[PDB]
């Protein structure tokens, strides 16, 4: 439900206030049962996540255990690998920036705890190029850990071998995709591959590979070291566990709090963070999972709590759980319009739907903000939207269509008036 | 996306990794599996950018040589990513985040202030070559929606006057306290932490026999 206890808050060093470095980490006791866990077995680790029923902490939601289970199949003579994507291009995902800037070890032991679960030879962490600062913090942390012998061959005084590496991103949101990151590592252009060859079977350097949101890798060790069931209790049904929530825009105290999942949307701005700037009635709309997920208008805001099942009932996605809030002084139409501008400046262009479709919606959306376009065009953008939604090679085209669909779904009268406003002044 | 050879930006310019740089080069390679030096392109191309911001056609060709890859390969990587600059950026490259999260926090409000202070249009270098302003997209520090990235400095919660203090510090002197401004630090509920105030539970706590 809500009011996650500090005693249950995984990322204790959030907000810093501790030594993100190892000695702070030791007081955190992050490396407490690592040898034991690995000793227990890879099968024991996946039992822990299956019991946890953790969902993907990245924009896509899938059982974390089943995804890791897939490349637990016997090696075919190719080294298995771990890829941690610290890229978070999605607006409002400062969620991950926290775990690299702070509590970097949380992720380092997440990597080896996760590594033996998939039997990965090594893990590469792709941080956003922008986070040069963040990249500096982690390898200082990674360097500490090996010096200790926590990672490396015979890591944590155990038979198992692991090596952790950090890879420089280069300002691309699409590099965040499950497969495209792999291609970026491989050194080719960051263009996603098709799903038929699933990442596990075909991978980074053509070997089995798996990709996890940094939050997903980070919570593993604590979910196993601590009781996974313990975590499970926090979640709701399929939904489970605490996921960091970032609230940004039109709220009195924008902040990232790792409060519990399944939180009433009205409650998290009202109780933690900062109540919606201007009052809870000054809420034109809420973007729950970030730019990719459709915004939900106030009417439904207070009604649904934050969890992926509840949101999909609501037609929106928990995604990165980045809450972007809009007051009534905003231009709903120009707000979403810049997100389509966010996607035309960013989609790879590999696939026909997304390439021309996202540019086509950008042109129509800019006209919509001006009000130059006629009212009949508004549903035509509906139809352009679903052509892009099911036909794209990756999910970004999936993502571009949803905000457009949300604007037409709940704010169709406002766009018509902008249509009307321009027609009147001629 | 076409490199029309120009006396300044052309193959004529000689590029070569400093003895120190070449060293760095190798370090990167080994990170990748053997015989996969190809992957070194992005990281290496980045060090060519570290060497020189311009990174001219000559520099890319050099990268191809070092990693043994086909030049077109490197050319494709440089063009795809915004991080690499194929034109001479200014000494201080100021990038203002203007995605919706920041906009709603008047990120644009920052823009107008910076254009006037630099006294220049958005997208080009100052005559002084001192600063270069560009309207970049989300930088991943939405919590502090007002935000500008100055050569990694990554400042935040910036207000016209805040940027004012910052731009003056860059123009005279250096290292202008890069980071947030209001003192909200990184993602602190401004009013109060409201959480994590309780002391760390300590190692062992909650193990619950896993």
């Amino acid at each position: 439900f809500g009011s996650l206890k500090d005693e249950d808050r995984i990322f204790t060093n959030l907000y810093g206030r501790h030594d993100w470095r190892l000695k702070g980490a030791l007081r955190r006791g992050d490396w407490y049962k690592t040898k034991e866990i690995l000793l227990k077995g890879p099968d024991w680790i996946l039992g822990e996540m299956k019991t946890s029923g953790l969902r993907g902490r990245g924009g896509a939601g899938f059982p974390t255990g089943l995804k890791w289970s897939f490349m637990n199949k016997p090696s075919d003579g190719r080294p298995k690998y771990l890829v941690v994507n610290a890229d978070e291009g999605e607006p409002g995902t400062c969620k991950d920036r926290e775990i690299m800037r702070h509590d970097p070890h949380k992720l380092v032991e997440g990597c080896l705890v996760g590594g033996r679960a998939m039997g990965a030879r090594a893990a590469y962490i792709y941080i956003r190029g922008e986070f040069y600062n963040e990249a500096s913090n982690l390898q200082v942390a990674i360097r500490e850990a090996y010096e200790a012998g926590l990672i490396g061959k015979n890591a944590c005084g155990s038979d198992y071998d692991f090596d952790v590496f950090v890879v420089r991103g280069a300002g691309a949101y699409i590099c965040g995709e499950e497969t495209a990151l792999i291609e970026s590592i491989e050194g080719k252009q960051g263009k996603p591959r098709l799903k038929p060859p699933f990442p596990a079977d075909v991978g980074v350097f053509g070997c089995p590979t798996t990709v996890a949101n940094v939050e997903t890798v980070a919570v593993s060790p604590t979910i196993c070291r601590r009781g996974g069931t313990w975590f499970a209790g926090f979640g709701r049904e399929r939904n489970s566990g605490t996921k960091l929530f970032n609230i940004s825009g039109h709220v009195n105290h924008p902040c990232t709090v790792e409060e519990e999942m399944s939180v009433p949307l009205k409650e998290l701005i009202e109780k933690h963070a900062g109540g919606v700037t201007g009052g809870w009635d000054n809420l034109l709309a809420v973007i729950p999972g970030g730019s990719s997920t459709p915004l939900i208008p106030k009417s439904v805001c207070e009604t649904v709590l934050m969890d992926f099942d509840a949101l999909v009932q609501a037609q929106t996605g928990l995604g990165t759980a980045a809450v972007i809030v809009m007051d009534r002084s905003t231009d709903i139409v120009k707000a979403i319009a810049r997100l389509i501008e966010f996607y035309k400046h960013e989609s790879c262009g590999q696939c026909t739907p997304c390439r021309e479709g996202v540019d086509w919606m950008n042109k129509v959306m800019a006209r919509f903000v001006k009000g130059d376009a006629r009212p009949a065009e508004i549903d035509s953008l509906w139809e352009i939207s679903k052509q892009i939604e099911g036909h794209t090679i990756c999910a970004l085209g999936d993502g571009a269509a949803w905000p457009v669909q949300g604007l037409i779904r709940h704010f169709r009268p406002e766009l018509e008036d902008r249509m009307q406003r321009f027609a009147q002044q001629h | 996306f076409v490199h029309r050879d120009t006396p300044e930006n052309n193959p004529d310019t000689p590029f070569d990794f400093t003895p120190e740089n070449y060293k760095r080069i190798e370090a990167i390679v080994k990170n990748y599996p053997e015989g996969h030096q190809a992957a070194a392109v992005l990281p290496v191309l980045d060090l060519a950018q570290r060497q020189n911001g311009w990174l001219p056609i000559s520099a890319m060709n050099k990268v191809a040589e070092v990693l043994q890859v086909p030049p077109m390969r490197v050319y494709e990587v440089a063009t795809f990513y915004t991080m690499y600059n194929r034109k001479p950026v200014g000494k201080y490259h100021i990038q203002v985040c203007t995605t919706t999260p920041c906009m709603l926090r008047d990120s644009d409000s920052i823009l107008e202030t910076l254009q006037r202070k630099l006294g220049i249009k958005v997208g080009e270098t100052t005559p002084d070559k001192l600063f270069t302003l560009i309207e970049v997209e989300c930088l991943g520090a939405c919590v502090n929606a007002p935000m500008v990235q100055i050569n990694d400095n990554y400042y935040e919660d910036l207000t016209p006057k805040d940027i004012e203090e910052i731009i003056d510090e860059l123009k005279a002197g250096k290292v202008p306290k890069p980071g947030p401004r209001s003192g909200r630090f990184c993602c602190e509920p401004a009013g109060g932490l409201t959480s994590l105030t309780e002391p760390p539970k300590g190692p062992g706590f909650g193990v619950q026999a896993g």
Partner: peptide, 23 residues
């Protein structure tokens, strides 16, 4: 921090990294 510090950390963690497989 400086432009070359991230890669120098890599320069340093080279030894830390054990050997890499070859195809």
């Amino acid at each position: 921090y400086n432009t070359y510090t991230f890669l120098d950390l890599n320069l340093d963690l080279s030894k830390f990294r054990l050997p890499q497989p070859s195809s």
